[PDB]
RNA sequence: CUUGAGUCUCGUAGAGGGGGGUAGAAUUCCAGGUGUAGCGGUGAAAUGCGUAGAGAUCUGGAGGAAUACCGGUGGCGAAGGCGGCCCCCUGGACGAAGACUGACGCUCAGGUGCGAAAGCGUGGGGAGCAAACAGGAUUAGAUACCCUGGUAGUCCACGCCGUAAACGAUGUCGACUUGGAGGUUGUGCCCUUGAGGCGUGGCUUCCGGAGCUAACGCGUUAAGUCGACCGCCUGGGGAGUAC
RNA sequence: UAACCGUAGGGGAACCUGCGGUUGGAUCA
């Protein structure tokens, strides 16, 4: 019941899952979505056409205000960097600026050895 | 080229990410490529030029 | 899984065990009866513990072994040996080709029954046998040496190459004999404490006991006992470890 | 990476910045590092670029 | 002696001190058997990034020639001076004059 | 390395003539300087080995020259080792 | 005596070394705001973290390690190795007009010194990563690979240890011997009118001729033709072990 | 689970794991 009018939307695009939260201008949570919470779980998610149905769920929780326009914050790779923005363009929302906020360091921390099969 | 104040002749050797353009798509005699990059680095401290772009 | 198949090796183990009529013998993992057959030939009765139902069924139909065998189709890890000793009416002579996987927990399981076991003859990884028997001041000496030697006289028998098994294991094997002490040379009030001291000492074996056992014994206490605080876990005798266990029991 | 356009439309322009960073210098990190594995495979893959 | 080139950026809301700061430094250099063959006031201007907060600072150049000794004295008065946000001074590379 | 006002200086002190930057008497002496001067440098840092390699170079290189003088004019040797306070 | 070797002058390029500063991106953590039932992970899963409010998101703060792009078939170093920007101390290499010394040189058992990483001692530090260790999973078993954690260690100082497939698996120095395409750096010259064109040195890639080679292949940076000095080999196992 | 060398720790046993180097690694990584 605040009517933020316009607020950026973060798209935490990951591999094992993807989640988009339609925060406000300053950066306050107004409504978040989630593939894991979008019916199918396990790992069936991930896929782009699976995240789209997730972020689209926001237009059902963050619609209580009246977002007439909003930007997009895509972070991290994975099947949900495009899908999300698309579903949002159809949901009825607008757009003000697309950008990738993926954490790209300068050889700072030393990543995990991991995987070796 | 050997400087940083000549910020005018630098925005060309970068992009929307302020990243130092390769020498592949420049063929800047190499010897000059070295100098060209050195400027963009030190020049970024004087906030004359940007490091990243998101901030 | 690794079935003993070499005839000469087999003979050598049977010779070492020396089963005599009237002894109550129990084999863990008879498998394809490599030892069961020749041991059983010397006895009137013999008990076996076999998890593989397929191989257990083949023992039962052996024309000479069958009539002699009591077969327990269960895991030896939680088998009540103390109760079996009561039924046989005498301490048990335990033997077997043990899977590397369960060998150490099984040995401790057996140790806990003290009196109920006359002796043990097991095939183990060669490096395990070396640790079991090791004395102070050597690489192989560790918590297992101390605990095993508290409970038993440790007697190396045979070293056995991979080619003796089908399929061959990846490492050398050895047979060891373990004999619970008739008279415990260094009795301990409470073994859990001995277990605790050795764990603490050997988890930091590259530190002096002053450092590794400092949470448990002051330097004054160590000095009073005749133990040098500059020594490391592996320099401390079985006797001294037991003296530390008793101190910690008589004083905490 | 900074998009912005007048006349609402979901054209793209987005894969334009997708040529300098993006999922590349990302997966580059992802798992472990490299050390000797790169200086080598980086100097062998170079051989490839000849013909 | 050895040439130089120091460009100090003083806090945006302390510009009025910039002119005074110059006289001190300059005077010292002259009183150090040195020379000053370059100078310019860039004033205030937007920054690439909010270096040390804000989004603007006062810029000034130099390109002296005084002996390293006396210039090493500058790093101190420069650090212990909240006015100046950032300090950056390169080496000689032969006398630089005009242009910029 | 060394300053011109010094290198071109000393040369005019050991040279049996003028601008004889070749003369052993000269070159040799020119080496002691850069050596003694560096000793104060190596006193600090220490770990700086790659610089000492060059230090040792000029040292042995200097000796290679001293042996020569002894094998070309006995006098000049003992006549120069003093002006440089060498031998220690 | 001057062409070997060296000195002087003046330039050039460089992640060569030692010290001290400093910047920006990211991680983790601490605090607070928004907001709400999931997050994380895998082939799946599970351990784990979540209603004591996570994850996400945003603001402020603390700290440590490493420096995207430039970055290359690149450069410097005796080797090992050496990448942000700045200053201070310092080594070597190369070119050019030249000027100077005058065989002062090459190699080098023993000797001295330098040595990746792991490891060791004392004292600091500790974000990420990660032997040990602990859970979860896989499996016939799984003291593993995989997953959730995680200690030494990795970082600093100072001292020790001296090994590596310390590899070009090819000792150092010098003289000769068809060619082709390229890289990097110096210099001379050319309507220097140009990106540019012609030479002449240093270092370096790839192809390849004669020759060499058991073959693979090496091929002016030779494993070709020669000369000086040094190290080394003499069947496999036992054994780089015992004493 | 590419292998091997060094070094370290661990384990019935080959061997597993970490750190650095190597090609004496297959497939367009």
**Number of domains within chain B:** 1
What string of DSSP letters covers chain C?
A: --EE--HHHHHHHHHHH---TT--EEEE--TTTTTHHHHHTT-S-EEEE---HHHHHHHHT-TTTGGGEEEE-S-GGG--HHHHHHHHTS-EEEEEE--TTTHHHHHHHHHTTGGGEEEEEEEEEHHHHHHHH--TTSTT-SHHHHHHHHHEEEEEEEEE-GGGEESPPSS-EEEEEEEE-SS-SS--S-HHHHHHHHHHHHHTTTSBHHHHTTTT--HHHHHHTT--TTSBGGGS-HHHHHHHHHHHHHH-
Find how far residue F13's CA is from the centre of its chain: 13
For residue C122, give its domain range: 1-184
Residue ranges of C for the binding site?
2, 4, 29, 50, 75, 97
Beta carbon of F28 within 7 Å of strand G? no
The kind and range of the H/E element at A89 are helix A83-91
- Of A28, A29, A12, A18, the closest CA to residue A72 belongs to A12
Same domain (yes/no): C154, C54:
yes
Cβ-nearest to E7 among B18, B46, B51: B46
Query: Which residue among C151, C184, C217 closes a domain?
Result: C184
Same domain (yes/no): C100, C132:
yes
Closest chain D residue to the Cα of A98, Cα to Cα: D3
Contact by Cβ (8 Å): A110, A49: no
Whether B47 sits inside 8 A of E7 (CB atoms) is no
For residue B23, give its domain range: 1-55
Contact by Cβ (8 Å): E96, E40: no
**Three-state secondary structure call for residue D40:** helix
Give nucleotides in strand H with any atom < 7 A to a protein C-beta. Answer: 1-2, 9-15, 17-23, 25, 29
Angstrom distance, C225 CA to G106 C1': 71
Q: Is D43 on the interface with A (CB under 8 A)?
A: no
Contact by Cβ (8 Å): C250, C189: yes
Beta strand C152-160 pairing with C69-72:
unpaired
Using the structure block, give the residue that is written with the tokens 């990410």: B17
What tokens were used for A108?
A: 């700072």
Buried b / exposed e across B12-23, counting CB within 10 Å, b at 16+? ebeeebbbbbeb
Contact by Cβ (8 Å): A69, A96: yes
Q: How many CA atoms lie within 13 A of E61 on its CB side?
A: 18
Any idea where the domains of chain D sit in the sequence?
Answer: 1-51
Whether E48 sits inside 8 A of B44 (CB atoms) is yes
Beta strand C46-49 pairing with C69-72:
parallel
- Of B14, B13, B12, B2, the closest CA to residue B42 belongs to B2
Residue ranges of C for the binding site for S-adenosyl-L-methionine?
2, 4, 29, 50, 75, 97
Q: Counting beta carbons within 10 angstroms of the beta carbon of residue A80, is it exposed (0 to 12), middle (13 to 18) or buried (19 or more)?
A: buried
Contact by Cβ (8 Å): C40, C69: yes
Contact by Cβ (8 Å): C200, C216: yes
Output the domain CATH number for residue C39: 3.40.50.150
Cβ-nearest to B5 among E47, E48, E100: E100
**Number of domains within chain C:** 2
Buried b / exposed e across C131-151, counting CB within 10 Å, b at 16+? bbbbebeeebbbbbbbbbbbb
Beta carbon of F5 within 7 Å of strand G? no
Closest chain B residue to the Cα of E8, Cα to Cα: B46
Contact by Cβ (8 Å): C175, C121: yes
**Three-state secondary structure call for residue E33:** coil
Q: Is A16 on the interface with D (CB under 8 A)?
A: no
Beta carbon of A81 within 7 Å of strand G? no
- Of E50, B49, D9, D14, the closest CA to residue A100 belongs to D14
Q: Which phi and psi angles does C96 have, rounded to 5°?
A: 160, 160
- Of A29, A12, A24, A8, the closest CA to residue A71 belongs to A8
* Residue C15: Cβ within 10 Å count: 11
Give nucleotides in strand G with any atom < 7 A to a protein C-beta. Answer: 6-10, 13-19, 22-27, 33-45, 55-59, 64-73, 77-80, 84-92, 99-105, 113-115, 120-121, 127-130, 140-143, 145-148, 158-159, 183-186, 196
- What's the CA gap between F80 and B2, in Å, rounded? 48
- What's the CA gap between F46 and E3, in Å, rounded? 30
* Residue F40: Cβ within 10 Å count: 8
Sheet with A9-13, side-by-side order of all strands: A18-21, A9-13, A72-75, A98-100
Q: How far is CA A7 from CA A14, A22, A59, F9, in A?
A: 22, 7, 13, 75
Cβ-nearest to D32 among A85, A98, A113: A113
Chain B residues with CB-CB distance to D2 below 8 A = 16, 53
Find how far residue F62's CA is from the centre of its chain: 6
Contact by Cβ (8 Å): A13, A55: no
**Three-state secondary structure call for residue B20:** coil
Query: Which residue among C184, C203, C221 closes a domain?
Result: C184
Contact by Cβ (8 Å): F48, F42: yes
**Three-state secondary structure call for residue D15:** coil
Whether D17 sits inside 8 A of B54 (CB atoms) is no
Cβ-nearest to D3 among A77, A94, A98: A98
- What's the CA gap between E81 and C127, in Å, rounded? 69
Dihedral of alpha carbons E54, E55, E58, E64, sign: positive
Contact by Cβ (8 Å): B48, E47: no
Beta strand C92-97 pairing with C117-125:
parallel
Partners of F76 in the β-ladder: none
Omega prior to C142 cis, within 30 of 0: no
DSSP category for residue F85: T
Spatial CB neighbours of E66, under 8 Å, sequence gap ≥ 6: E1, E4, E28, E29, E32, E33, E34, E35
């Amino acid at each position: 019941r605040k009517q933020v009018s316009d607020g950026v939307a973060h798209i935490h695009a990951s591999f094992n899952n993807t989640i988009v939260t339609i925060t406000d201008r300053q950066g306050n949570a107004l409504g978040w979505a989630t593939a894991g919470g979008s019916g199918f779980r396990g790992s069936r998610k991930s896929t782009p056409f699976a995240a789209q149905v997730a972020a689209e769920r926001c237009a059902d929780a963050v619609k209580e205000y009246g977002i007439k326009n909003l930007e997009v914050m895509v972070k991290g790779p994975g099947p949900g960097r495009e899908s999300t923005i698309r579903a949002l363009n159809a949901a009825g929302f607008r757009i003000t600026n697309i950008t990738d906020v993926t954490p790209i360091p300068h050889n700072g921390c030393r990543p995990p050895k991991k995987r070796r099969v | 080229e050997i400087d940083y104040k000549d910020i005018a002749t630098l925005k060309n050797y970068i992009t929307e990410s302020g990243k130092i353009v390769p020498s592949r798509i420049t063929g800047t005699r190499a010897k000059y490529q070295r100098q060209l990059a050195r400027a963009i680095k030190r020049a970024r401290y004087l906030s004359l030029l940007p490091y990243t772009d998101r901030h | 899984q690794n079935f003993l198949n070499d005839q000469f090796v087999i003979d050598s183990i049977v010779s070492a065990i020396n089963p005599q009529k009237g002894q109550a013998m129990v084999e863990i993992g008879p498998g394809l009866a490599a030892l069961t057959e020749p041991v059983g030939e010397r006895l009137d009765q013999l008990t076996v513990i076999e998890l593989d139902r397929d191989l257990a069924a083949r023992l039962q139909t052996h024309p000479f072994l069958g009539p002699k065998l009591t077969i327990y189709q269960q895991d030896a890890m939680t088998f009540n040996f103390g109760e079996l000793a009561e039924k046989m009416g005498q301490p048990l002579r335990v033997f077997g080709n043990l899977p590397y996987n369960i060998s150490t927990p099984l040995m401790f399981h057996l140790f806990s029954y003290t009196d109920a076991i006359a002796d043990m003859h097991f095939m183990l990884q060669k490096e395990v046998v070396n640790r079991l028997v090791a004395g102070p001041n050597s690489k192989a000496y560790g918590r297992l040496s101390v605990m095993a030697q508290y409970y038993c006289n440790v007697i190396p028998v045979l070293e056995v190459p991979p080619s003796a098994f089908t399929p061959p294991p990846k490492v050398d094997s050895a047979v060891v004999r373990l004999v619970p002490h008739a008279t415990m040379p260094h009795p301990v009030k409470d073994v859990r404490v001995l277990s605790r001291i050795t764990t603490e000492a050997f988890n930091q074996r590259r530190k002096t006991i002053r450092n590794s056992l400092g949470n448990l014994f002051s330097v004054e206490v160590l000095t009073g006992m005749g133990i040098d605080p500059a020594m490391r876990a592996e320099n401390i005798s079985v006797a001294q470890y037991c003296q530390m266990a008793n101190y910690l029991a008589e004083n905490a | 990476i900074k998009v912005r356009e007048n006349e609402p439309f979901d054209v793209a322009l987005r894969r334009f910045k997708r040529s300098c960073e993006k999922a590349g210098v990302l997966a580059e990190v992802r798992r472990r590092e490299f050390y000797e594995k790169p200086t080598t495979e980086r100097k062998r893959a170079k051989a490839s670029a000849v013909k | 002696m050895r040439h130089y080139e120091i460009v100090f950026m003083v806090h945006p809301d302390q510009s009025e001190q910039v002119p005074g700061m110059i006289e001190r430094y300059t005077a010292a250099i002259t009183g150090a058997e040195g020379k000053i063959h370059r100078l310019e006031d860039w004033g205030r201007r937007q920054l690439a990034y909010p270096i040390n907060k804000l989004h603007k600072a006062h810029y000034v150049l130099m390109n002296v020639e005084a002996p390293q000794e006396v210039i090493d004295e500058l790093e101190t008065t420069f650090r212990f001076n909240d006015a100046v946000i950032r300090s950056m001074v390169m080496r000689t590379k032969h006398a630089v004059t005009e242009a910029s | 390395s060394l300053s011109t006002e010094a290198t071109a200086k000393i040369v005019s002190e050991f040279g049996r003539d003028a601008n004889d930057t070749g003369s052993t008497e000269v070159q040799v002496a020119l080496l002691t300087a850069q050596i003694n001067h560096l000793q104060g440098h190596f006193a600090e840092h220490k770990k700086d080995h790659h610089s000492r390699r060059g230090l040792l170079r000029m040292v042995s290189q200097r000796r290679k020259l001293l042996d020569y003088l002894k094998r070309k004019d006995v006098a000049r040797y003992t006549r120069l080792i003093e002006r440089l306070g060498l031998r220690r």
